[model samples]
Target: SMSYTWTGALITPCAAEESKLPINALSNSLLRHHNMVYATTSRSAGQRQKKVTFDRLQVLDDHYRDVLKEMKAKASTVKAKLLSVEEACKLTPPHSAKSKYGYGAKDVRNLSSRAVNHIHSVWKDLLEDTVTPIDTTIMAKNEVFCVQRKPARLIVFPDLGVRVCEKMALYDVVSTLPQVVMGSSYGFQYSPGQRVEFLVNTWKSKKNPMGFSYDTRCFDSTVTENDIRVEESIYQCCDLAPEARQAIKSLTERLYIGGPLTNSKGQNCGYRRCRASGVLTTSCGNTLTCYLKASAACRAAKLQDCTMLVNGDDLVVICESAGVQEDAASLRVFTEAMTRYSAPPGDPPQPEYDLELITSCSSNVSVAHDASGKRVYYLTRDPTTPLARAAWETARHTPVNSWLGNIIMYAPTLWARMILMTHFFSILLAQEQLEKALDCQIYGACYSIEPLDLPQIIERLHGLSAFSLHSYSPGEINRVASCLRKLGVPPLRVWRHRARSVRARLLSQGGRAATCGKYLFNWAVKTKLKLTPIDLSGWFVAGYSGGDIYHA
Candidate 1:
């Protein structure tokens, strides 16, 4: 008898290591640019940020009040309770940041009293220690771009203890209130299907010269102490217990406005003089302020019927055009207004002749083919990150897989449905863990996802078109090829061939595996499989439903 190990690389390949240990093939590609992946400020950069502190004033106007009022109105109707030490502890993933008090995330999740006591101490400190700026750790992340790879941008966030406190103090508020204040401007509010529809409809509603997109350079870093304070003012307008109110104010002044920064070697790197990443308020603060400034700017520029769609720093404006020359002049005024308000454009704003050409949130609308050869429109982006994460998951267990999230977000895309679904499911089948529910994050919240629920999940999240999309644009195809080659991965043809075998095995297994086979492999079959609804009652382990914020 021979003993064999299930390597889980049968579906997607892995990189060979020095010890002959399995490693993420795509992760290895990132190793080359590991140093560049992280962004850190030099002493001069830190000094520059500190110099532009709270001295310059931003007085709240009626517009700010109106936005705050709207946000408070929505926050007023909600009921949010703080999770208990153990309960909140359970939400902390094993890979989450560890506490400086000698306990790791695993210890916290496993109900260690020591961890719980340390967490409680942190929360208490948040309530009592309102004056001291919280300490933060800085790290660079490596991310894959199509044909281009770059260093992970600097992520400035508070320590693990403060993170747990953030969840208790402001998680619910940030999650719910931004959509209410910004409405359609809230980026996380819509799925790709809803997003593309909103864009197309908004664009067509106006004639040519109607659509344009805006990008803000270093949007997070550009946030001034005054900007953070204004966001705090809005947050304070909401109804909350006195203690909660005090906690919010303190957290803003200390941790949010600026925090002490430490590097990997435990050296004092610098201090964040701007809005730090990895906090509950980062997205909402950016949105509320961005919308407030842009709305005012649009009015100042006298642009007609200016309907806006915003996602943090990414913005698109669709309004009645005044022809090319006038539109150019109007955009100049718009830029001036945004600059005065401190939200300067990274690139000078310009109008788009076509809505399909406008890219926001790193995605654009592209046409792909269905199995029947009919053209299908779906959302797509460069597949560098998805490939990298897939390679990681193939080699080892991870808290969350970006590949799964991509399937949910871009399920209808030709690449996602064909490439991601096949590779992950094949590996899961090989390991006999197809039905095993795994944890992943989307929009900064964790959820337990099962492979069995994928068909229905993808259908609900991305629509039925997810199962049918086949053809892709030449640019999309070229990008995918470039990404694969750069990452040293096999071509899509090899993936399709592997999927055929995986689909057969899934169908032979029957039940939910059969459903997975049908929905995930419909393009390969002679007769396309029809989608049946899956009950969504327990499908979501955590997080709110799509479009729930608007209702709130």
Candidate 2:
């Protein structure tokens, strides 16, 4: 009889139209591809070479049957619980309180409502954990099938990792990468400084020295075309933090060009500040008379402390006479004030100055150049505390290729699963192959290393299901080997031993072995039989066993 094999899961295409789903169902798009690979691939290579074929559809059907069995189990558990709850409700009338607050009329009034609430809670739990999962059909009774699909759109494939295909509106493959990093699933496992970069479009417009004439048209006049062009801009970012070092690294990586530009630190060029003020002065036609009055007043008031302010090469003052005050009493007062005022007009600039400053910074300022070498600069408010904030703003643009980035990108599930599976399978498979091929005692690291006990190892092996992994680390490989070695199991050079055994088994079976070492070796394990390589039938038996041996 031809034997068919099936892995335990299938990928059923979603029922919705493409428009209804996010792009490719995002990550799960790959799951469907892997599912097709599993569905069609031969269970064992020996079966493929034996001139034997099986129905792929039959394998799929068998898998569907397995799903039915699991659903049946779920249904049975939930149905029993539901029946018990319904029976309990019948016996315990709603709101039949043990306290004196309850009487027949009052209790009866609340009975129906209380009963409904109690049953609702029971049904919700049942439908969520048990029955609802069994029948995922959305049209199922009680609308229980409508429960949120948790870790939504989870798809697992052999060797390939589990993927969570999320649905969201506004996803840019560029912007979305960081989102993966920050997402609850992928958070923090990555190194703290992972960064990612993306490119965006910028426009550069050329201006004519002579401003454009609103009245002019190109064909009728001497108008020249300005060289405006569009350029692509790159931005980078890292995990958000207050530190500027990572952000500075990111910027240097992006905009760096070789020169004094290299030797000059960005901090030297990044500082900036800007400000406004009001002033008063004199205007009188009789210069010497007014000056003497002012001079006498200056003599009394000491104006030598006042400083001169200059514009270009000249010192000038705004008129402040105000029509000489327009009143006899004010004029008399001005005459009296002129006697008391300080410093005469002929005195040189004063030693002390009054500066009304609006803004400032201490760093060496320079322009930041774009791709076109155009420089831009900024003002630093507080030299002490400013860089911390600037660096944080810049980090949002860091690149995503760092080791931290991968961890952030695939953290909580897929990335973790990959790391775990890789650690487990790579060593186990490698060790098993080494043992079978070399037949050598390769299990222990050194003579002093303890060997594994054979009975315990086999028992452990028997306990593992197809889905169970032995360990999540490389140490597991040596541990298994050591345990087996401690049992006094002799490790022959596996390749030589297996070759000799196959020959012996084949000769005993009365036939010459064919050129099928890989196939037969795998079969030996599946059938749990010893075979010599020379016996063709023994080799055949090694290859023909059903589903017991796989990865080899």
Candidate 3:
């Protein structure tokens, strides 16, 4: 039996894919899965899989009917609210990707005539032209991992003009309606703490529940035209306005069903025969269809007490398991059922006896020590990419601030506290942008983050106990150490030394800045400091967009 493990570099296709492999080898290998051997580096598994292109196909049984029925019933309860042009414009980030059209992101937000007119034209085109498929740009992305890099992941997103139109038409619907339908099962709705709590409790509930993560092979490509249309059918079930319904139908036909694929340098790559990667609806659509298929499969397998936590194509299931032999057999049955429904697992699903050992959302629970020598359990991951990206951001300006997103997502992790927060804030202080909130995105939505509110934000995002955690996992520490060297970042000891002086200096200047130093840097202090909430009237606000919080 093959024990599932990931240990390859996070590799992405550059201009010179073949030529750059040797020079980019070191950086590429840093974040990929362990199973991805060197031989596979030159050509990603996805590229090879694409050679044997298959037509859109699916075989639905009675299980599919039941799942769709339940989904429709839940969607009926949702009252879809169409967003106004102004409301959608507000959600657009200042640094959003620029449109090929005459106007840019700032112009769109400021409601410049050119930008507004272009957006309106796009929306109008979508409503009127239902036959022409949208064009998409396909790019490769390489995300960082703890010990090793993963293979380059492909992204297919619509042009910038279409994105803005999506916000005005469907952003609100995708953000709100899914939560109402999926409830706790909707992955984006929960915080890291909430996710862990649910996973732990669900596992404990079963007398012998087995949990495992499932990955779909080329998930986006597997989405047939029928799948897209079916998802649209579900959207139509909601009590949407007349315009909203027309817009949804048009988007489904023109963009969702299939689209043209454009590459860099303005070349027509080809037409996308499957789901596009980067779009407002991508995540929501994947999640919805995945749940429908998986739920029905679980029933077909006769798995007891199946509770799922699905984020896009990634799925974690905790359910009643028989003995070892029997459980293995049950998983085989589940796999067959999923295959029949057009959701074949990338790798065979294996059962994990322990919930904590199972990693989901690229995060796992790790043990650390608190200020008083007590053991602490907090969520953490390898900080390879965050540190690298922080180094990059420190030197130059970028569209999306990866460091800010990492800090927001993994604020409680030791690497985040010592490295990300310290480095970014120190730079911000020097630049006099400490009070100037910058925008960072989560789950494809935008949020404004201020450095001064680190204390209150940290406390709200993670528990106060996060500040005192110590003794991180060796894997995490090792990865952080390597990342610092690769990214030319200072070591842990140096950060600790600088943090003390920084803390003292911050305390001298009284206000929210001081609060951030005390609480965010509490781990460096001899005695741990507690955080208190301050009235964040205009400074901050919390609400979900695409299941993410945005403070205007």
Candidate 4:
């Protein structure tokens, strides 16, 4: 009692439970002490004690408000006239044959200064540190095939991954089939078990489809003596023993393309223009169907859809690699376990995602979480599905809430929570910007035909009486907002991947696939991982889509 120890063990612990704290003071105490301790300590330990979900969202709202102020000021500084929808489309820029710049790949000259100002406005709003969701407002696909290297159990570096060329016929079931390695620097050969496992994971039987077999057609670029069919070659490789062949035969039948069409590249496999609404396009008329054929043929034996044909080099085949069997087994096990986590209520019917398996693959493949997660969800890449389309609808309906009245509610007491929440909610905000931009570009600023009118869209989306406290958790909301922010970005621009040789084939001059890939992949990968957009390169020329000048 006589000793005066200066040790600070008497400091109050921040995580007192609500029941333990005096009545009516829990929220205030947590909020007050959390900041007080968090400031004094090098790092706040309270995060471990209680869920900060709602706190995070508050941070986002604050950040969003600040950005709103900045955007409005910027908009005032610029004087430009917003063009009608037709004029805006003409200014979109890719100017390349394959649309290297993605959606906005055309001459901006056709666009008005007003449009440029608007675009700048939209972009700056996103640059702010606010969290928002940008679900499937845009989508694209990246197709590749992995070939087995013989004698080794794994496929190593420099194996030529398979891709489709001009053969649009076999686009559907490409991944489900087996493919040959096309590169001279082949490393690992696949084991029999490895081949069997890869097929099982890649192929699936879906309802509403009665076909016993799925087919894929592919382009083969090297049309020489060494060229081989992915499915046939892998089937033969794995089916060395009679039992192996019979075992594989019982699984599924799919097709692989081989021959003269190998080297031909730079072909368009999809419908050039996406329809405004309903049935934008079909896989049957696109090059992706070839992938389906090869994949289906590889998985099932004698299944009717397992067939393919090799066409000319104008639509040449590219890289292809097979996924490993062990990975599939790991996914199956993990999926079974992760199904225990309940889906958020009102979530579209997502078939059980094998999270453990997906998480495992994310680490193994070095692919980001959202990208891989999408693959786990959209096994079939049903672009027009309700789940897929809903993301776009949400984007379309939401708007950048640049209310001048918001400044009145601003206060420093809420600063920390708002900052934290911005990190979580940025994606939702980004998508809102993207949709608005699209509307301004594709439809007239005043166009009421589409659900893009700013006031109308926001009113409809927020009007639902469903805004209960169900979405009120600070941390949870922040987490979702964070996810949205991450997804809202366009692809990055890097020189390493965008080689001129590659670009000469798929995109025209002055194209920016890196930028486009980043943008499209942002949307596509987040919603469905298995569906990644591959950036293609090709030639430059002057052309038009709906009277829009394609190039400068």
Flag regions of model 3 displaced more than 4 Å.
1-57, 140-152, 368-377, 471-494, 530-551
> What TM-score does each of the candidates earn?
0.80, 0.12, 0.83, 0.20
Q: lDDT, candidate 1, residue 509?
A: 94
* Better-scoring candidate (TM-score), 3 or 4: 3
lDDT of 4 by residue, 503-548 (tens): 2321231233233222222221213223222200101011111122
Q: Which stretches of candidate 4 lie over 4 Å from their true place?
A: 1-298, 301-452, 458-469, 472-552
Stretches of candidate 1 off by over 4 Å are 1-87, 142-149, 207-209, 368-377, 392-399, 470-494, 534-552
Can you give the lDDT of residue 208 in candidate 3? Answer: 87
lDDT of 1 by residue, 44-123 (tens): 23333333233222344555465556655665665545556666566566666677789887887787888778878887
Ranking by lDDT: 3, 1, 4, 2
Per-prediction count of colliding residue pairs?
Answer: 8, 54, 26, 118
Best by TM-score: 3
**Each prediction's Cα lDDT score?**
0.67, 0.19, 0.69, 0.21
Clashes of 4: 118
Q: How good is model 4 by TM-score?
A: 0.20
Q: Per-residue lDDT tens digits of candidate 3, residues 399-504?
A: 5678887887788787888877776676667666879877777655566777787666667666777777777778768867876675455678988877887777
Sorted on TM-score, best first, the list reads 3, 1, 4, 2
| lDDT-best of 1 and 2 | 1
Q: Pick the winner on lDDT between candidates 2 and 3.
A: 3
Which of candidates 1 and 3 is the stronger one according to lDDT? 3
